[model samples]
Target: IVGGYTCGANTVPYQVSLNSGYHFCGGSLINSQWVVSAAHCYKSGIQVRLGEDNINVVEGNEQFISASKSIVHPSYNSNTLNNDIMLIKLKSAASLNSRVASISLPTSCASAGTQCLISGWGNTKSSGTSYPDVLKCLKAPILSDSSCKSAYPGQITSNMFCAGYLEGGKDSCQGDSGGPVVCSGKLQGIVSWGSGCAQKNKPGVYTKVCNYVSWIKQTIASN
Candidate 1:
């Protein structure tokens, strides 16, 4: 799921109502058969709603074919946020209806300093409360590998990418995990970690989507 903003806020791009009324993060519909998100978002009895703005009130145009199984990267390390990726395989194919369209994966090269967009229901400010139903979006430039490495010292890994404003404040916070980080309109990363949610000297970290193309393709093929 993208992330929660405030309690019952209109921040969620789509609403996902589970059995117990416990809503989780939101994700993009990548294709008729798959949805891309972070590994930590996986949970049982989940459903996805697409093509809507107010998550708590708006009725979505499309109800996705729920996934029977969610496969998280086996090597994912919760402690370090490594290999923090997951794919949901829908039980059936989705039909094109209304504004519910699929997102395309990145096939070309993405370089440092590339500008990208991030959307979620996470906190608007550091130390702020999460908005339950509101969806928020922000833009950030991809940090060069050297700069990212220097910022985190040894914390930055090859499987991860860093992006955010270096001037303190403005970043994805707690509930924003598993949301997409798109560069040039192509998904390049998944929100994973940060020092303290948009603080200076610490940018948000995400799974490098480019680095896992092979794994994603192979998994889809096998399925």
Candidate 2:
């Protein structure tokens, strides 16, 4: 249920729905009550469904929680994608079950050579169209800070993390933004941007979750 191939042949490991026939990129559950995702993925109206396969079927006794309020990081800029993370507070706490589970967020910095998972219903290749129902996923190794700096030159920031295969055949493409990058069983990053889908020398970029922990914790505490 967590894995599928996009129409264009890309694979994904995460899935979520906002409307009957529309699906968007989202992160794994952080808790029964909260889900982490990208701010841009947040729209005015949508519902969060957790623990279900085949979104079209909608047959499983999954938990359907309406978002009571959605909050995007104050520093988020659609243009620059600064602070591109957001948290969805469920209208009510969900009951934890076998099918309903949460993913752990990273509490410390990740080192280079770490492998992470990226999943979504994004395009399979650069310049490709969105996948309607299927989700795509790929594995990427964490890039060393110095390596990432060299690749991105001045564009790379400490607030971001880089991951992808240098060969360029696989990656998190468009519509994959805001989805989770799992490392060592923890949510370490959120898919943000890349030069182009699965391009050589252009690794997928993500918002470093560790840099915004205080903000995330404070935001959730106040709400």
Candidate 3:
């Protein structure tokens, strides 16, 4: 369960499992048929599963939809993890219900020290093989860009920011990429990269959502 507590069912309804043949990355439903994820999570046969807490079981509330098209941000740098965002255009609009909802994007960037929550089914520990079937969540604090840079050195970029704990042991891990980091009841970041899961000094790095609102809106409208 991605090294966090078990979140209440439907607590974050916008969450989706980016199923690439099977379990893969995490994402959030931004609309009835649109999903936002990390560009690096792209894989063959990528589909989305909504309203699902346990991915292995076919729950009545779950909706599995095919991805018709996808658009990765042109500025995304796979090598540097910069602008690591992508949009999934679903073939069918998911029926919204208590188990399914969309998250609001941030109007502006997240303030440092913002309280946030992230949920996903990535890993239980860093380099430790314990992937859970049920989704999990963790409370995190937004790390300032300066503090983030100090941890990441010259690697931190404008499009990326850091979150999680400086003391370590509470952060997103591998396979949690593209997961939502909600702050102030809005989507402020997406899980992108990190030094390790819950490690000391190193925190989780994410793509700032506020930086791409304009680009996302324009792309959605034009597409």
Candidate 4:
């Protein structure tokens, strides 16, 4: 997250690191056994690290669990980056604690102008290799669909939304994909893509999670 502040340890308990030898993406723990992430982050045999605050240091609360199964949305379009969501069933249920727990999925869609927190261990620079060892977060307002369309002509879709300052300075960049854009404690969006990290008039785009509620429930139920 560029131009963000380090989040307090265990404050965002539902946040999880999607790893394969290294931290590549972030996800949300929707339940003890299922994590919701971006389909672009999918890879075979990925590991889910729960209760992680700082990736470089070992925290006793951290639990490393292999992904038992991963199901990416069937309609996911890589070229257009639509339906960019995925669910990973854990090898076993994560133990719940103050530092590890599931987050509630949104019952209704978040409206435009809603201020939300976007957090991750992704790059803190718009350009460069700087990445945070500890989780970082910043507040960004959700922009209206028309505004998003204006920013990325013919690119915005119902499955996606935009959030961040038009003047720039903050955003979820590379390595933050599949992380949460939480609003009022509800899991609302998933970091998907952007033109550039914190670019002016190019706010961060995210998977509009509310549109996939039934798909998520059905997939988890039938799988």
Candidate 5:
């Protein structure tokens, strides 16, 4: 969300504010009682809020839901950051409204060179620790798998991918983990990690949502 401009209210309605009594990562509403985010963003006491562009100020359209459970991917590798995606089950279903909605997930793998958008309430600078109260969004171009592997070496796994400007100065930073990586109106990825935010040649990396589509369905169905 950082290194970009403010996103319009309801522009990305499925966008969710992942918090632990305080704002932290971003998330996407998948359904009335479920959310999708990055597994690395996991922590104790995380919940979700919807229908608001600003986190600091509560609006009439805002809806708060407690987390019932968090199911991290079984294949998640912390060291390599592979399979860094998860689903959070809400204690109760969310109330749908004009400002709150769910996003559709990708049915197939996204081709390379695709343009995508990621939004979050993170810092404007990579080295900066501060975060914004309002959300921000940026445009990212999906890099080829070979180029992505070259950028991060062994860090880029099959379950992961990269997207951002090659020259830099535009990407998701800290506090953006678990945010939405939307492309062609479908959820293609989840903000996972990066060597440095907006660093040259080190584009923003995300968990390839399409790779885990079947796994997501299985998890949701069984759980």
Candidate 6:
């Protein structure tokens, strides 16, 4: 997270770290057994760790759980980066506690100018190896679809949206993909792709999570 601060322990309880060997992406615990992340983060043999505030430390609050299944949105387009959401079912349900819990999904879409929270263990800089040891967070306002369209012209999709300052600074960076873009305490977006970390006229683009509520619930129900 560029221009962000280290998140206090247990403050963002629903956040999770996705790892194959090391932390690669951020995820949200939507339920005891289900975690939502970016489809681009999908990989075999991935493990999900809950209650993690720092990636390098061996915190006793962490719960390292294996994924039993991973499902990407059927209509996802990698080229366009649309529908960039995925769900991972844990081998066993996470134990709910102060440090590990589920966040509620959005019931309605967030409007423009809504200040939202973005958190992850992604890079703190746009270039080079600056991935943070601790989880980082930034507060950025959600941009209108029309305004976002202008920023990336012909690149924005209905399933994708933007947030952060167009002036640069304060944004999610590499490895932040699949992390939460929370609005008013609801999981509203997922970090998917962006032109560069905190660049002028190029805010962080995210998977518009409000469009996937039904798909999320239905998948969890049938699976």
- List RMSD in Å for every model shown: 3.8, 3.8, 1.1, 0.7, 1.1, 0.8
Per-residue C-alpha lDDT of model 5 across residues 11-74, encoded as one tens digit per residue: 8889998888888888999888899999988887987989878788976688888889999998
Off by over 4 Å in 2: 1-21, 130-134
- Cα lDDT of candidate 4 equals 0.94
Please give the RMSD of candidate 5 to the true structure.
Answer: 1.1
lDDT of each: 0.70, 0.71, 0.88, 0.94, 0.87, 0.91
**Per-residue alpha-carbon lDDT of candidate 1 for residues 40-134, written as tens digits (9 for 90 to 100):** 77787766555545556756564645676788999988777789898877777766554556666789647888987777755565765656455
- C-alpha TM-scores of all predictions: 0.85, 0.86, 0.97, 0.99, 0.96, 0.98
Q: Higher lDDT: candidate 2 or 6?
A: 6
Least accurate stretch of 10 residues (summed lDDT) in model 2? 1-10
| Model 3 C-alpha lDDT per residue in residues 38-146, reported as the tens digit of each score | 9999876888999988888876688899899889999888899899999999999999987899999889898899989999988887767788788899988888888
Highest lDDT, which number? Answer: 4
Ranking by lDDT: 4, 6, 3, 5, 2, 1
Q: For candidate 3, list the clashing residue pairs, or say none.
A: 169-198
Over 1-223, each residue of candidate 6 has an lDDT whose tens digit, in order, gives: 9999988887899999999889989999999999999998889999999998878898789999999999999988889888899999999999998889999999998999999999999888876668778889899999998889999999987888899999997889998999999899999999998888888888989899899999999999999
Looking at candidate 4, what is the lDDT of residue 49?
Answer: 97
Error of 6 at 123 (Å): 0.6
Task: Please list all clashing residue pairs in model 5, or write none if there are none.
Answer: none
Candidate 4 residue 149 Cα shift, in angstroms, is: 0.3
Better structure of 1 and 5 per lDDT: 5
Mind giving the per-residue lDDT tens digits that candidate 4 earns over 6-70?
99998899999999999999999999999999999999979999988989899779999999999
Any idea what lDDT model 5 has? 0.87
